[PDB]
């Protein structure tokens, strides 16, 4: 029921998940029983006990065949589309009928048959734990939620996620894209200022990386382009550390076996490599040790951030090419970008933020902890945006939310070129930015001539052009010509442009009046 | 409302129009494009409120 919902925001990723709500119109991410706000998307069974999050992640070494992980993208997919690469070190996804299933021992008896569970059943059991942790912290039973999803989630996947949540007694109010949630996490803050920006969201995750280019006008977001990558990500960063310390192990212990060839040894290396990686985001030096790595041999070593950034340079340049690809895919140039929001756990790496600063001009704001004082934790953005969206629609009826998402509401004409006025001195001033969804209205204050008097307001079209690099405006077709009589010396002339759904342009130029309409 | 430190053109001598306005051009369907918004944020809900 709309009046009695207990809503939260949920981020549901392949590697980690997070839950959030709003207190006094501010999003706050909830920690679960383990104290984790980034809760591993892992399920594991030992002696009939169900474990999730970090406790389940710890069983990846001792209990791999009864642990299920990296299953978020498997939901709602045919088996022929499943990539089992990241599941190889745990329960394998297999084909049973027209469903993807995992075979695990979730019963208590030692001579009990292992259960065969669909991926939808695994998701349901995991979502019960996530919601269960949110309900325990809130003191109330969580009933509804907004969940973020990638922009290439198929409709079949959307249904499976909603059906899985329903089986967990959780009502899904709305599914929103992961990039739009990251933008909302910033825009919905009290100190935020709404203004026209071209925004690049760099979501650097564990098993995937997604970069999205959005046009943000009038507090509303339109996705211009998106790129996906499954090669450059945090797991690839774990690998450069795994390879680095294993070669040190083999040099320190000649004749010993390679720990990457033993599945138990490799599992220990993954947990420690990720832990060393995160420490290099908080400090310039991090330790790496595994008690009894292989053949009873211990190993302990160190690495500084400088050495890490050198051996991981190939992965870092993969992140750069991803961002350049998305900007190019939108027909834009780095000079066209206003904000770069860095999202996902891997976006905590200080060097990646410094690299993006070199890609974009200094006028571009890099929203990362090490490059901006007002930045948020990159791992909390998606959960914060989902909680902010959930609090906005928690009183809506289910019918109202569905209609608000139909094509008749979301689709509307976007003005291709800019609409502005010509400035002359003895230059094009943009008023309506390019790719502005209509209806829209903007207003600028310009300087009057040296003494003023009669002044010409010439409304024209505008386009951006890059000159070798520098971004300039190019004046195109002329739209209207208006006049303001007897303007004061040193006064400012206010020029307003209004575009309707009809594409009609209404022009106003009153100094603090003349009005005109272009059908 | 954005303040810009740029001067407007002085009106040439002998220029006039009905109510000091002259319509020269207009927007075309070629000059626009149908794009899809993200159904997120209070400003979208306000837009969806007006459309319904
Ligand atoms: N402080 C940190 N510094 C560097 N990397 C980190 C940090 N914290 C987390 N990570 C990395 O971020 C990755 C997980 O990021 P995130 O939680 O956004 O992924 P996800 O979306 O849950 O998973 P996937 O990307 O597979 O869907 C992991 O590889 C982890 O090692
Ligand atoms: Mg993610």
Residue numbers in the entry:
A (entry chain A): 9 to 434, 439 to 480, 523 to 566, 571 to 577
B (entry chain B): 3 to 54
What does the primary publication say about this deposited structure?
We now determined the structure of an N-terminally extended RAC core comprising CtSsz1 with the complete CtZuo1N (residues 1–60 of CtZuo1) at 2.5 Å resolution. The structure has been solved by molecular replacement using the previous RAC core as a search model. The Ssz1-NBD adopts the typical actin-like fold of Hsp70s, which is divided into two lobes (I and II), with ATP and Mg2+ bound between them. The domain arrangement is as before, with the Ssz1 linker detached from the Ssz1-NBD creating a loophole for Zuo1N and with the conserved Zuo1 EPVG motif contacting the Ssz1-NBD at the linker binding site. In contrast to the previous structure (Ssz1-Zuo1N19–60) in which Ssz1 β8 was disordered and its position taken by Zuo1N β117, Ssz1 β8 is now structured and aligns with β7 of the lower sheet. Second, the N-terminal extension of Zuo1N contributes two additional β strands (β0, β1) to Ssz1-SBDβ resulting in a β-sandwich with two mixed, 5-stranded β sheets. Zuo1N β0 complements the lower and β1 now the upper sheet of Ssz1-SBDβ, aligning with Ssz1-SBD β3 and β5b, respectively. Notably, Zuo1N Phe23 inserts into a hydrophobic pocket between the upper and lower β-sheet of the Ssz1-SBD. A third insight gained from the Ssz1-Zuo1N structure was that a conserved region (SLPLPTL, termed LP-motif) present in CtZuo1N between β0 and β1 binds to the RAC–SBD in a substrate-like manner. Notably, the Ssz1-bound LP-motif adopts an almost ideal poly-L-proline type II (PPII) helix, which resembles the binding mode of proline-rich antimicrobial peptides, while the DnaK-bound NR-peptide adopts a more extended conformation.
Ribosome-associated chaperones play a fundamental role in de novo protein folding in all kingdoms of life. RAC is the J-domain partner of the ribosome-associated Hsp70 homolog Ssb (encoded by two nearly identical isoforms SSB1 and SSB2). Our results indicate that both RAC subunits contact nascent chains and form a relay that transfers them from Ssz1 to Ssb. Structural analysis reveals that the Zuo1 N-terminus contains a conserved motif (LP-motif) which binds to the Ssz1-SBDβ in the same way as canonical Hsp70s bind their substrates.
